[PDB]
Amino acid sequence: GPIICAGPIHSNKSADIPHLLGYSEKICQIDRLIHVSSWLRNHSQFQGYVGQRGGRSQVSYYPAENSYSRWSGLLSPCDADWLGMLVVKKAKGSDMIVPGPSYKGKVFFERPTFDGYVGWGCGSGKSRTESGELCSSDSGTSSGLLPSDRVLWIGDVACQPMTPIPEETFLELKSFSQSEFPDICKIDGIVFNQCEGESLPQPFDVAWMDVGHSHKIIMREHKTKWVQESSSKDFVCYKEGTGPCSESEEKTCKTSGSCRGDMQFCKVAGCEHGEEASEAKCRCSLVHKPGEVVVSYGGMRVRPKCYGFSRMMATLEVN
Amino acid sequence: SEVQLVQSGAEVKEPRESLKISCKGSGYSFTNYWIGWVRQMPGKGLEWMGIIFPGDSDTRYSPSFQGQVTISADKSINTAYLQWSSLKASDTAIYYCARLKRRGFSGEGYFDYWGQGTLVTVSSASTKGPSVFPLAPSGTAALGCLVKDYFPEPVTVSWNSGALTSGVHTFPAVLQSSGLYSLSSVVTVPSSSLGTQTYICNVNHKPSNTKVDKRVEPK
Amino acid sequence: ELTLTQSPATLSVSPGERATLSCRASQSVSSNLAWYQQKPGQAPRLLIYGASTRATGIPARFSGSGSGTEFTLTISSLQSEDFAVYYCQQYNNWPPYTFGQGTKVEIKRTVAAPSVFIFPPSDEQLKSGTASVVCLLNNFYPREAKVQWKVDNALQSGNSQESVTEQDSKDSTYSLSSTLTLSKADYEKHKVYACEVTHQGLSSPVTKSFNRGEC
Numbered sequence: 001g002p003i004i005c006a007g008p009i010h011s012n013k014s015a016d017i018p019h020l021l022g023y024s025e026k027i028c029q030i031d032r033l034i035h036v037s038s039w040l041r042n043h044s045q046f047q048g049y050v051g052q053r054g055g056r057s058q059v060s061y062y063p064a065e066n067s068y069s070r071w072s073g074l075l076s077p078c079d080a081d082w083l084g085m086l087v088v089k090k091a092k093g094s095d096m097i098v099p100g101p102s103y104k105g106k107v108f109f110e111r112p113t114f115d116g117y118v119g120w121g122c123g124s125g126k127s128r129t130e131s132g133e134l135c136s137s138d139s140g141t142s143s144g145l146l147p148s149d150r151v152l153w154i155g156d157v158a159c160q161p162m163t164p165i166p167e168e169t170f171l172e173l174k175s176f177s178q179s180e181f182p183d184i185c186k187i188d189g190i191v192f193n194q195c196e197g198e199s200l201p202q203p204f205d206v207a208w209m210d211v212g213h214s215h216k217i218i219m220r221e222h223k224t225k226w227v228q229e230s231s232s233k234d235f236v237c238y239k240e241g242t243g244p245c246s247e248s249e250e251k252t253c254k255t256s257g258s259c260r261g262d263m264q265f266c267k268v269a270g271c272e273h274g275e276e277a278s279e280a281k282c283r284c285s286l287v288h289k290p291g292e293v294v295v296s297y298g299g300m301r302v303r304p305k306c307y308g309f310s311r312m313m314a315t316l317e318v319n
Numbered sequence: 320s321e322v323q324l325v326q327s328g329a330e331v332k333e334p335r336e337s338l339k340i341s342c343k344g345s346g347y348s349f350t351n352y353w354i355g356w357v358r359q360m361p362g363k364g365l366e367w368m369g370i371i372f373p374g375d376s377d378t379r380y381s382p383s384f385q386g387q388v389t390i391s392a393d394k395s396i397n398t399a400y401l402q403w404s405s406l407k408a409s410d411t412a413i414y415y416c417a418r419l420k421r422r423g424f425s426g427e428g429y430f431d432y433w434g435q436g437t438l439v440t441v442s443s444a445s446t447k448g449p450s451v452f453p454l455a456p457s458g459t460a461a462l463g464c465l466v467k468d469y470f471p472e473p474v475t476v477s478w479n480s481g482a483l484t485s486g487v488h489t490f491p492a493v494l495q496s497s498g499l500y501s502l503s504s505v506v507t508v509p510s511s512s513l514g515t516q517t518y519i520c521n522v523n524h525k526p527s528n529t530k531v532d533k534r535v536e537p538k
Numbered sequence: 539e540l541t542l543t544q545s546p547a548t549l550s551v552s553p554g555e556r557a558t559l560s561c562r563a564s565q566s567v568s569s570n571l572a573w574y575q576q577k578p579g580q581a582p583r584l585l586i587y588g589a590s591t592r593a594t595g596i597p598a599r600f601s602g603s604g605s606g607t608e609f610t611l612t613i614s615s616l617q618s619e620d621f622a623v624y625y626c627q628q629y630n631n632w633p634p635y636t637f638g639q640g641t642k643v644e645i646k647r648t649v650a651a652p653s654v655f656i657f658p659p660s661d662e663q664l665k666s667g668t669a670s671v672v673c674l675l676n677n678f679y680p681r682e683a684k685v686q687w688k689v690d691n692a693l694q695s696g697n698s699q700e701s702v703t704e705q706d707s708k709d710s711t712y713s714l715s716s717t718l719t720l721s722k723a724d725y726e727k728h729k730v731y732a733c734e735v736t737h738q739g740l741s742s743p744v745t746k747s748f749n750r751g752e753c
């Protein structure tokens with residue numbers, strides 16, 4: 001289900017996509033896949049929208065049995081991009097498309113890579129071939145009001161506001177990863193260990209975290225703990241049936257203790273209920289997720305920007 | 320063990336037919352508590368019909384139902400009953416049984432545990448599959464399907480074989496005076512898709528083993 | 539000589555707020571008053587007996603008060619499962635077990651005007667010998683709406699039926715269909731078929747119409 005807003009029923013492909021300043025306003029655009037729509041328009045000159053009727057909850061995932069997608073409040077890379085936390089960059093010819101997903105008919109797909117996040121788009125009237133390598137014309141996409149299953153998010157991924165770590169901690173994490181995967185040479189074309197002879201690039205499923213430096217920390221043995229911290233971004237503010245509150249309304253609810261709220265919002269930021277002369281006022285409620293994830297790895301505890309399990313392309317040592 | 324009242328299943332009868340529905344009590348001393356029956360006509364409130372004390376089969380009826388129904392009990396099988404000699408169309412309703420809890424000499428008791436209810440449908444019609452008619456269109460537009468003259472409930476309605484679910488309203492069936500049901504299912508669509516998108520409503524009536532796919536087109 | 543009057547018939551209230559429902563007996567029933575809850579699609583269940591005693595396993599946010607003729611059911615902070623119908627019941631005087639007519643507790647939202655559409659009968663239905671004209675009111679709030687059929691300006695009664703959805707899970711609105719049914723012969727002796735809709739969200743009534751056999 002959605003964080004705030006049920007799936008869009010757009011009426012035309014030409015409607016503009018406004019920039020919205022409020023957090024809950026942004027969340028509602030995310031619920032409606034307006035951010036992926038905006039990405040496609042910027043980068044592929046796509047016309048219109050993805051997510052018609054279905055919204056974010058009906059996106060396709062690889063693998064399809066996807067743990068974090070069950071929690072509407074966990075952010076995907078595209079979600080985090082819209083919130084300014086990272087950038088899903090337009091794919092270049094050198095970015096490798098992983099085998100496994102069902103690419104045929106897709107209009108957008110995205111995967112984490114070793115050093116970032118990459119998206120592949122299609123222009124108006126086109127969709128992806130079975131291999132994902134090319135866009136071909138597809139009469140099923142002519143309306144420009146496309147369903148959510150045309151959007152493919154690769155990986156079991158959760159993004160979250162990060163607690164930055166110093167370079168010294170990154171370099172010790174990085175050395176621990178190297179010691180855990182001594183046979184890997186490159187990942188997604190990025191040197192991981194020094195090698196001479198190497199395999200061809202191969203699909204590689206791995207746990208990883210993005211800790212905000214030059215590349216991800218990939219992990220074999222690691223521990224995670226989820227704790228609900230009830231920070232201000234863990235709540236959204238809306239009115240029943242009518243969508244997100246404005247930026248200034250949201251700021252009032254999350255600073256003054258004077259708005260309606262669910263129990264956890266009352267418990268943390270304060271709430272006031274009843275009475276009113278007329279019209280329902282703003283309410284804030286807890287976003288549905290396990291909380292904030294802390295990763296134990298190599299003797300360190302880190303609150304990463306993103307954490308996930310997903311497929312990348314790796315070469316292996318040959319000797 | 321907790322108190323449970325389990326009623327018999329839904330009934331479909333013709334006018335002037337007889338009908339006996341049942342309510343089986345478990346988890347308590349059956350002979351020692353009144354059992355009541357409560358009628359709920361479609362879209363209306365609750366009306367008390369009568370009570371029976373299974374210990375000695377003493378009965379009390381509301382004046383509204385006295386002489387119209389008979390309430391009985393069989394304590395050998397912990398079951399209470401409600402029955403009609405000759406049903407009318409206006410007996411279509413949900414019927415609940417409920418156990419009466421008495422506390423003292425001042426009042427008459429309240430209903431502390433309820434059965435799940437028995438739907439009774441009275442129509443002179445026999446099993447019949449629906450006719451499906453387009454609601455032709457007509458920013459956004461509305462289109463739909465009129466699913467008319469079927470019996471009994473239920474029909475199921477989907478759009479584009481289930482690919483289209485958001486923005487659909489399938490209204491509750493109405494039991495017409497002909498004894499047949501009718502409903503409409505409508506959906507909101509972009510006007511610009513009228514003529515480029517195909518909209519088909521799939522209507523399935525299991526009691527008549529009928530499936531109908533109806534394409535809904537402009538003009 | 540014994541009525542139970544519940545007010546209001548529909549209580550529109552926001553999640554987390556306190557709700558107060560009242561029951562007035564036309565004559566004293568002491569404390570012998572019970573409250574029942576009926577959730578959508580479910581059987582009623584006891585909430586309160588003896589005017590103020592909460593039944594076993596009922597959440598603590600439900601309380602009842604009163605004695606004599608004026609009774610209250612209070613829900614201290616409404617949860618999503620509390621939007622339901624509530625019935626009061628008298629068990630003091632014969633004929634006992636008088637039920638109130640019910641108070642529906644529904645989700646409050648800003649007024650939303652219906653989008654109104656009219657649908658003429660299909661050729662396929664006309665060739666079956668009957669004609670159904672459908673008027674659709676989509677996604678409005680509150681529930682109260684007036685739909686009147688005019689057949690060349692003559693107001694119709696007795697040949698129409700309405701059907702309404704439940705309050706929608708996501709946007710908390712209602713939708714409504716009104717179906718006018720005529721014989722084919724009756725359909726064909728009139729020209730103008732019109733649906734006229736009155737609703738709080740509309741500054742003035744809205745009429746949707748067509749002419750038999752023209753577009």
Ligand SMILES: *[C@@H]1O[C@H](CO)[C@@H](O[C@@H]2O[C@H](CO)[C@@H](O[C@H]3O[C@H](CO)[C@@H](O)[C@H](O)[C@@H]3O)[C@H](O)[C@H]2NC(C)=O)[C@H](O)[C@H]1NC(C)=O
Nearest residue numbers: 017018019021035036037038039040041042081082083084
């Ligand atoms: C598709 O292109 C859009 C145009 O570049 C881009 O929108 C731009 O997004 C940025 C980042 O969110 C906004 O940046 C600034 O907005 C306000 C001022 O209005 C500042 O207070 C913020 O701090 C922020 O710096 C731009 O306003 C916005 N521009 C427009 C014209 O909308 C989209 O982000 C692109 N889509 C994707 C998926 O990247």
Ligand SMILES: *[C@@H]1O[C@H](CO)[C@@H](O[C@@H]2O[C@H](CO)[C@@H](O)[C@H](O)[C@H]2NC(C)=O)[C@H](O)[C@H]1NC(C)=O
Nearest residue numbers: 009010011012013014015016018458459510511
């Ligand atoms: C495409 O759809 C949008 C959204 O409905 C239209 O924008 C609305 O237009 C109506 C008038 O037709 C205005 O009253 C609304 O205020 C507009 N809403 C917004 C959010 O802008 C848009 O006009 C449509 N485009 C075309 C070409 O019809």
